[PDB]
């Protein structure tokens, strides 16, 4: 089950709409949730910017517009305890932390590897994490469920925008409940993310 429709809206059609293998499932590298882990985030256009057909289209097309089918799964045992909040944050602007630093491309656009949260409490944006449930979210409880499905449509003030210099939304997973285990258990459990870009459109075929 665990089906969630972000804002009750479906990715949709209005360009070139390939929809042959650009809509296939891309599975990012698993993240090892540890006991001292602080969480990770992924800026989605940046995530798929080098993954085969989608990467080729996104890098060599000026404009782009598509939804996304998201599946976050955490493979844990019944002897592991912890909680994980999976929220999608439209225009997740990662901020600096100078008491004026200007982050860096490794943080703002972290790629398919993703980047960790330095201060998960403030979401690295100055906003408290408690209120982050306003976004389309999903709880992952190791005691109840493992799969977290979010279907996010195209959220932008303009019908199309570049997939290389702008991040449509960010996907964050945060261990609100620290991972706890006994002796001899797997000290780091994996979190798997699969991406299905429904209704993809591309335009402006640059070299």
């Amino acid at each position: 089950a665990n089906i969630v429709l972000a804002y009750g809206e479906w990715p949709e059609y209005c360009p070139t709409r390939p929809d042959v293998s650009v809509n296939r499932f891309y599975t990012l590298d698993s993240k090892m949730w540890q006991e001292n882990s602080t969480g990770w985030y992924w800026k989605f256009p940046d995530v798929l910017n080098k993954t085969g057909v989608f990467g080729q289209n996104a890098q060599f097309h000026y404009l782009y517009r598509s939804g996304f089918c998201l599946h976050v799964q955490c493979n844990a045992s019944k002897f592991h305890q912890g909680a994980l909040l999976v929220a999608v944050i439209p225009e997740f602007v990662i901020a600096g932390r100078g008491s004026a630093p200007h982050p860096g491309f490794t943080t703002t656009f972290p790629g398919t590897t993703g980047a960790t949260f330095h201060d998960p409490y403030v979401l690295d944006s100055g906003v408290p994490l408690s209120q982050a449930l306003i976004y389309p979210h999903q709880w992952i409880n190791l005691r109840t469920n493992n799969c977290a499905t979010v279907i996010v449509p195209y959220i932008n003030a303009v019908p199309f925008d570049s997939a290389i210099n702008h991040s449509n939304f960010g996907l964050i997973v945060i261990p609100v409940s620290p991972l706890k285990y006994s002796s001899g258990a797997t000290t780091a459990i994996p979190i798997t993310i699969t991406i299905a870009p429904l209704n993809s459109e591309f335009g402006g075929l640059r070299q």
Partner: peptide, 20 residues
Amino acid sequence: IHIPGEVHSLLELCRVETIL
């Protein structure tokens, strides 16, 4: 244009669960 997630009142923002 049609931008999903339109709000009309703060009550819509109040009826969402949020961590204490």
